[PDB]
Paper text:
(d–e) The periplasmic ring (PR) has been reconstructed to 2.8 Å using C18 symmetry. There are a total of four chains within the C18 symmetry-imposed map of the PR. Three of these chains were unambiguously determined to be portions of a second copy of [name] (DotF2), DotG, and DotH, while one chain could not be identified and was left as a polyalanine chain model. Located in the interior of the PR is a portion of DotG (residues 791–824) consisting of a single helix that starts from the inner membrane side of the PR and is followed by a short loop that extends toward the outer membrane or ‘top’ of the complex. The short loop of DotG contacts a globular domain of DotH consisting of two β-sheets composed of four and five β-strands that contain residues 104–263. The interaction that is observed between DotG/DotH in the PR is similar in structure to those previously reported for VirB10/VirB9 and CagX/CagY and likely reflects an important function for retaining this organization within the PR. Located adjacent to DotH and on the periphery of the PR is a small globular domain that we identified as [name] (residues 207–269). This portion of [name] consists of the same residues as was discovered in the OMC (DotF1) and thus, likely represents unique copies of [name] which we call DotF2. DotF2 is nearly identical in structure to the model of DotF1 that was built in the C13 symmetry-imposed maps of the OMC (RMSD of 0.5 Å). DotF2 engages DotH using a similar interface to that of DotF1 and Dis3, with buried surface areas of 575 and 655 Å, respectively.
Numbering used by the authors:
A (entry chain WF), D (entry chain HF), H (entry chain GF): 207 to 269
B (entry chain XG), F (entry chain HG), I (entry chain GG), J (entry chain WG): 791 to 824
C (entry chain HH): 105 to 263
E (entry chain XH): 105 to 155
G (entry chain GH): 156 to 258
Write the structure that this text describes.
């Protein structure tokens, strides 16, 4: 599948980058392909909770 | 009785401002273009 | 050694009287007050563009322009065929209620209303006409005219 | 018949436009062809009462 | 700890003495006053062209 | 009782500022470029 | 967006935000740039416009939170002015708007 | 049918865009083709109530 | 009782500075290079 | 008891200077050589 990584996060929004180079921006209730619905955007600590249980974080080599 | 004259003096201040605003009429302005 | 903990927490409350949770609540109070201040009573007018025919007979009624306070309305003058008709001069009554911007050669007048419910008239003279064109200007209606095309009965310098 | 619509209204007068493009102005007591006599001019809410029972209002597409 | 809630609600009432409901009602009072000021007594004259 | 008269004076100061800001309408600006 | 100069259509809407820059670029029906002759802005206390006097791009910044107005733009070859409305404080902000004009 | 989306909303009015590219503006009491009568324009949260029961909101990809 | 009135005056001074800082919006700057 | 209020006023003087120094950010300097 496609893995998404956090590029920048403020309260409210989050800018994401995928393994294909595609760039997205998401809000509190939003759709991510392959992940589902955004459940919680937590601006501190760089964590995004998703309805499928997966957690989107910063990249390990870019943090 | 005492509150009647206090209300009357407030209305006289507002009525004087309303009357002199109705007196003012400005002159027309003619603009020539070339 | 116990005194140093007591002095530090009392100094922090004096330095920052508002918590980070209370700063967030105050910012929501401030923007809600700005939203109620900028809201308009009733419904706002519908922005429209119109087109009228102006008859210079001595039986007809002068046309009506609908305006709004702080908004811009553009008036463009055309002849019977549809070509533009340039403006020679204009004469405005009650300049304290309306403001007109005009470059001195074109055929477009841009009128902005200054007051809420005060209305007047305007005199417009075209280049080839001898009969002046009379308009009335009423603001504060249910519709606002963004642009009015005016068909004048004669034939202009362009045809 | 002809349908009349309110174009502008102040206290006292009202400017009307018809389906034929004819433009009228009316007062409190006045004659409208095909409608009768003006009964009441209501500057607020854009309603004109007529002796035949019909009500002249603003146009639906221009209001 | 309960003092901080009491001081916060009293400070808000001094900072904003008018509610968002009361700002909306005051704007309707203001524009109704200008409508009565600009209204003409009787009926306005009919605009005509003559010869 | 006297807390009503104190609250009324604070609302009159805020309402005078609100009405004065609604009066202000700025003139349009025409910019010509060449 | 496509802009229609018919007398029945509605003027287009631009979404702005306070402190942010929105750029508007004017194109014709084929897609070529259309230079601007002049513009007329109502309520200059709510919006700020930067423009070099020859190009076809306007850069507008909103100054207030929820105050909205209109704007008139005259192009080089057109006689009909273009009317826009400018509303800030929405759920979307326009970084760049492409406008097709009919002529 | 045709799906309408909210483009901008203030108290009172709302500007809409359709799937055909058509643009409309509506008031509190107004007609929408394929939807009926506008029942409530709620400027906060981007919701418009309609007499047929459908709800017109902001677009998911543009919000 | 009197500690509430002391705490209220401290928050009113800090809230005035916060609101006044949020009012300020600086005009954009256009830089042309050649 | 009174030694707490003396210590608290000394800490407020030092914390004001620390916060004021952290606000200062100096603008970058571009040096062109030819």
């Amino acid at each position: 599948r496609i893995i998404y990584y956090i590029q920048a996060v403020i309260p409210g929004r989050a800018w994401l980058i995928g393994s294909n180079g595609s760039t997205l921006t998401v809000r509190e209730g939003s759709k991510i392909p392959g992940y589902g619905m955004v459940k919680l955007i937590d601006s501190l600590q760089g964590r995004i909770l998703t309805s499928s249980g997966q957690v989107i974080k910063f990249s390990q080599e870019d943090s | 009785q005492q509150e009647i004259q206090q209300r009357t003096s407030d209305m006289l201040t507002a009525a004087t401002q309303l009357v002199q605003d109705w007196k003012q009429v400005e002159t027309q302005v003619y603009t020539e273009g070339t | 050694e116990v005194i140093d903990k007591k002095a530090f927490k009392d100094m922090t409350r004096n330095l920052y009287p508002l918590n980070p949770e209370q700063v967030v609540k105050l910012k929501q109070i401030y923007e809600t007050s700005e939203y109620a201040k900028a809201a308009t009573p009733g419904t706002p007018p519908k922005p429209t563009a119109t087109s009228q025919f102006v008859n210079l007979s001595p039986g007809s009624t002068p046309p009506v322009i609908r305006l709004s306070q702080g908004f811009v309305s553009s008036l463009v003058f055309l002849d019977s065929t549809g070509a533009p008709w340039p403006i020679a001069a204009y004469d405005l009554g009650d300049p304290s209620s309306f403001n007109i911007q005009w470059d001195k050669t074109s055929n477009t007048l841009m009128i902005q209303a200054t007051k809420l419910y005060n209305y007047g008239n305007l005199a417009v003279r075209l280049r080839g006409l001898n009969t002046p064109v009379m308009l009335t200007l009423i603001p504060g209606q249910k519709a606002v005219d963004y642009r009015v095309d005016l068909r004048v009965q004669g034939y202009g310098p362009n045809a």
